[PDB]
Every structure is written in structure tokens, then in C-alpha cells.
Amino acid sequence: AAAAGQVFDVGPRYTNLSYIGEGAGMVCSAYDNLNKVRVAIKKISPFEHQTYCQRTLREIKILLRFRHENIIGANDIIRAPTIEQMKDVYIVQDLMETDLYKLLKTQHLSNDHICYFLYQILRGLKYIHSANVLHRDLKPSNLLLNTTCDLKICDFGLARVADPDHDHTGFLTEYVATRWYRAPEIMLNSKGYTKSIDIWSVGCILAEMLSNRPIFPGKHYLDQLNHILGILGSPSQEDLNCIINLKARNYLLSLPHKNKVPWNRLFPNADSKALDLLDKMLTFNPHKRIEVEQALAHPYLEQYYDPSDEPIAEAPFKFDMELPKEKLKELIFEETARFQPG
């Protein structure tokens, strides 16, 4: 009994709705009457398809367990008082005006902005990684921004617990995360269960911040690899020897030789410390790729770096990655109980 454009009934607490929609259901802003601030509300309607259930549960479990200035929280979650009556779930969050994807369509960023956004991306990422979680879908639309340049990472639906022991797979194994921000190893021999997959995406985001265009816009699964290799050049023998997978190694060896395009050719207006950090994020071999704490400690970020102000999670995270649709509904109901006066 309160609509927008569908039903969007968010109790007595939240009023003066206004569409911003099509994200997960639909998104509105709304006046919060207990805190008198405007806030964002996302309506989730996932109990039909069993995969949107999994993404929803995963996202709720993470959002509630994580507490960090550069990671979007869930201030409130609204659903029916019973499982029977629960059809929709609404997640209430800090209202963030824009995201980096929308910003970059229209705005050039000064070096000071690039530096600050990157610092905040990596500060959030350090927390995430310290919990043994991988985000796995970092991209400019998953980076929210407010009018005062605060950056918050959102969308933990593809997130997983890190599992480097079980990261190997065969050549051309299908993947779900967004193509342009996929590390080379996803196409070759990785399931994306190590931390280095997120650092690659961050590197892609940096490159995008410096030029306002995706650095590796592959049209489909292997074109992505040829984009990467067209800039980085052919992998060294020693990087090839880290790929044991014969199908992947022989594929790479079949390719004509390509030299590196130097970053300063691609990004002639860029701060050279920015390009050095970029280089180290967009390293072909995931074993040699810089880690989140090394990136924060890089000279480019020296105006911000302060590890005592770069918090870590209080304990490791415990196993997303799995259950029929009816059990999932029940877990979601149980995970959201703390917001019920009930």
C-alpha cells in the first residue's frame, strides 16, 4: 500500500520515495524518519530463481559481518515477520549519489581524485582480503561515491572464501564475473579463488580512471586475453613455466610474439608513480602481482598510507559457495532476524 513507478512498502520508518532503479528488483531513495537523513533502499525479490537466492544470501551474510568505511553496509533490512509472508527483502543503505561507472561517463578525474579513490578502493579491499574473502566482481559500477568523494565497495554476490589450494582448473573454463576486469589466469588455469584476482580488477579500474575508457574491452572470452597480451606483450618463459596446464601453455605458445606497449605511451598524461603501481597490479603472473598491502604502501599513495588507520577484520569468514531454494529462504530469514523488533 505505497507504490513507486511497483510495490515499495518500507514500513512506517521510510517515506518520500523516489526511483533510481533497476539494479539487483529496483532502487529508490527515501526519507528516514528515525535519523531524518535521506537513504537508499534496494528491493530484492529472489525467492523464485534459486541462483538469485544464493547471491542474496551471500551478499546479506557479508554485508552484515563486514564493518568498514569503504564498504557499503546494510543499515536496515526489511522483510515480513514470517517466512510464509516473506516475498521481498529490502536493504537500506547509506545514500550514495553516484558510482564510478556513471562518473567516468562524463567527468575527467584529476590526479588527486584518482589517488584518493584508489587509496579508498584498496583500503576497503584490505579489509575484505583480511577476512579471507574475495570480491571477484570489482568494476567501476560496484564502486559507490557520495558528494564528498567517499568511496564504498558494494555487490558481494559473486564473493567467495579464498581457497588457493583449489584454484587450478582447465583451459577455457567458463567464468561468471565481468569480462573486462577478468585476470588472464581466469582464461587459462584459474577458478578465481585467490586474492590476486581482485588486484587485477583494481588495476583495470586504475587504468580506466586515467583515461576514462576500459583498458581491456574484449568482446568475448578469448578476445579478452588477446587484449591483455596486446598491451602486456607475450609472457616470458618463466611465466609460461608457472602454467603447468598443457592446453593453456600450448595455446599461448601458438600465438605470434607481441612486445609490451609501455604504460607511458598508453597514458602520457599520467603520474609516473601511478604507472609504476599500475604495472605492478597488471602483472601477468599472479604470483608476482602486488598484494593489497604492498599497493597501499606504494609511493603513489604516500599522502594517504597509514596502516594503523587501515583496519583488518576481527576474524576470517566462514563459507559461502553453496542447498535447495527453500532452505536458502530460511537462511535469509534467519540472517535478517536482528532487524526485527519481533
| Level-2 CATH architecture of the largest domain | Orthogonal Bundle
Q: Estimate the helix proportion, in percent.
A: 25-40%
Order of helices and strands: EEEHEEEHHEEEEHHHHHHHH
Largest sheet: 5 strands, antiparallel
Query: Which strand order do you get reading across the main beta sheet?
Result: 1-2-3-5-4
Say what the CATH topology of the largest domain is: Transferase(Phosphotransferase), domain 1
What are the salient characteristics of this protein?
342 residues; alpha+beta; Phosphorylase Kinase, domain 1; Transferase(Phosphotransferase), domain 1; 2 domains; five-stranded antiparallel β-sheet; three-stranded antiparallel β-sheet; 10 strands; transferase; signal transduction; phosphorylation; monomeric
Description:
One of its GO terms (cellular component) is postsynaptic density. Its cofactor is Mg(2+). It is found in: Cytoplasm, Cytoskeleton, Spindle; Nucleus; Cytoplasm, Cytoskeleton, Microtubule organizing center, Centrosome; Cytoplasm. There is one protein chain. By secondary structure, this protein is an alpha+beta fold. It folds into two domains: about 1-95 and about 320-340, Phosphorylase Kinase, domain 1 (2-Layer Sandwich), CATH 3.30.200.20; about 95-320, Transferase(Phosphotransferase), domain 1. The chain has eleven helices and ten strands. The protein has helices at about 50-65, 100-105, 110-130, 195-210, 220-230, 235-240, 245-255, 265, 270-280, 290-295, 325-335, and strands spanning about 15-20, 25-30, 40-45, 75-80, 90-95, 100, 135, 145, 150-155, 160. Helix 1 (about 50-65) packs parallel to helix 11 (about 325-335), helix 3 runs antiparallel to helix 4 and helix 4 packs antiparallel against helix 9. The longest helix has 20 residues, at about 110-130.
